[PDB]
């Protein structure tokens, strides 16, 4: 065994570099391995020193560059470049960082420098940090190039994000998944499969998306909500970024509305997915009043609002199958 050591920074970026480690190990083999969560350490147990970790890392990085080139200085539609990043400067910093990583880690040699840390990877990142009275002229916090690349690959491949921009304002909501006691490669690959909702899905749906919460619910509809597979249950931490008039900041770091919306979706579509998909899609398309009613029944939970949504369902021609109301009653408890 090797017992890959992982430095402790914060249980958001540290879990990201742990995701990078585990994805690099599962890429190329690494059988009979496990992930041991230690609150923040998030260590890995694998019987290999360094062959397949390099093989998987170079394969993942080649896939990263290929996706960056396919997506469209060097701005693209990639999640790790502009799909979740809120800064226009990141749209050009990511290509040069990936190019430097390609020029460095391809002839079997280590890294020579470091890099900055973004808000998306760690919400606690900023160029202004106070020590005793004021801030410095630079940024004291730096991330190693290998750690930076592993955090990037974990962020793009594992944690899911929801993007919705209205003309000038732009909203991105990234909800990362963390363990509590223990996980395994089955859980790791399930979390990788959870990553969906490709960056650009906007053709006409915005005409009914209007509210940010409604768009978030619509995009969470196409996501997944099953976690009992892994034999160990998970937790979700969601952070949001906004950009109104090219001004980026944080307005939500630990909020329950994503979690309760996700639980409501999971408990609604458990009794069917076809009828649930049809119902939600129809209400979002034409019964916009019903959609706002449902979001008001979830945000500031009030049960009667659900009924009004169902009322608009009859205005929308929804089939309103037998199992949908049963699932809603099960949600009611």
């Amino acid at each position: 065994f090797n017992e890959f050591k992982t430095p402790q920074i914060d249980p958001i970026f540290d879990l990201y570099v742990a995701y990078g480690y585990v994805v690099s190990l599962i890429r190329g083999g690494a059988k009979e391995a496990t992930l041991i969560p230690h609150g923040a350490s998030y260590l890995i147990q694998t019987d290999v020193s360094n062959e397949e970790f390099r093989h998987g890392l170079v394969d993942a990085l080649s896939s990263m560059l290929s996706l960056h080139i396919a997506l469209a200085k060097l701005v693209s539609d990639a999640d790790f470049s502009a799909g979740a990043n809120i800064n226009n400067v990141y749209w050009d910093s990511v290509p040069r960082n990936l190019e430097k990583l390609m020029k460095d880690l391809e002839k079997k040699r280590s890294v020579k420098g470091t890099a900055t840390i973004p808000i998306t990877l760690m919400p606690s990142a900023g160029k202004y940090m106070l020590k005793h009275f004021g801030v410095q002229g630079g940024n004291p916090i730096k991330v190693d190039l290998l750690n930076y690349a592993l955090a990037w690959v974990g962020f793009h491949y594992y944690t899911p994000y929801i993007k919705y921009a209205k003309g000038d304002t732009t909203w991105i909501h990234i909800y990362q998944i963390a363990p509590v006691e223990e996980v395994d490669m089955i859980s790791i690959l399930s979390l990788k499969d959870l990553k969906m909702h490709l960056p650009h899905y906007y053709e006409s749906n915005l005409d009914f998306l209007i509210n940010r919460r409604l768009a978030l619910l619509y995009h969470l509809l196409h996501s997944e909500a099953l976690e009992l597979f892994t034999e160990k249950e998970f937790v979700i931490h969601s952070y949001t970024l906004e950009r109104s008039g090219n001004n980026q900041a944080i307005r939500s770091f630990e909020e329950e509305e994503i979690g309760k919306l996700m639980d409501f979706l999971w408990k609604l579509k458990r009794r069917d997915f076809y009828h649930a998909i049809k119902f939600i899609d129809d209400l979002l398309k034409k019964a916009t009043e019903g959609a706002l009613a449902l979001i008001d029944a979830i945000m500031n939970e009030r049960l009667e609002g659900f009924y009004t949504a169902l009322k608009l369902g009859k205005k929308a021609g929804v089939v309103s199958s037998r199992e949908i109301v049963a699932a809603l009653e099960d949600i009611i408890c």
Binding site: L303, E304, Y307, K314, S320, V325
Partner: protein, 107 residues
């Protein structure tokens, strides 16, 4: 339990095949802060039920059937201990939700 039949027999008022569309009764049942008004709403539903049966047997579709007495017994023995308004609201909203569902009325 005992929600399937009451929902099925309450959904007939708002069903498309019945051209009376008693939206008001279901509205009153839905958001009822006290037990007496939701009881009045379901009473109005049961009062309109003979009209639905008559129009169903006139049209040709199978007539609706009165809810089973055990359903009424369960509703009565559950409505008494609604000390907290939250459970009462939960029951009323559940009844309203099951009042909006698809049923095989006219084959």
């Amino acid at each position: 339990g005992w929600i399937r039949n009451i929902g099925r027999y309450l959904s007939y008022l708002v069903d498309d095949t019945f051209e009376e569309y008693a939206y008001d009764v279901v509205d009153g049942i839905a958001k009822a802060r006290t037990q007496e008004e939701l009881l009045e709403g379901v009473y109005k539903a049961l009062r309109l039920a003979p009209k639905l049966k008559k129009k169903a047997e006139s049209k040709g579709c199978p007539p609706p059937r009165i809810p089973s007495p055990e359903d009424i017994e369960a509703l009565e023995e559950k409505v008494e201990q609604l000390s907290n308004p939250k459970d009462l609201r939960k029951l009323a909203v559940s009844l309203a939700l099951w009042a909006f569902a698809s049923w095989n009325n006219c084959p």
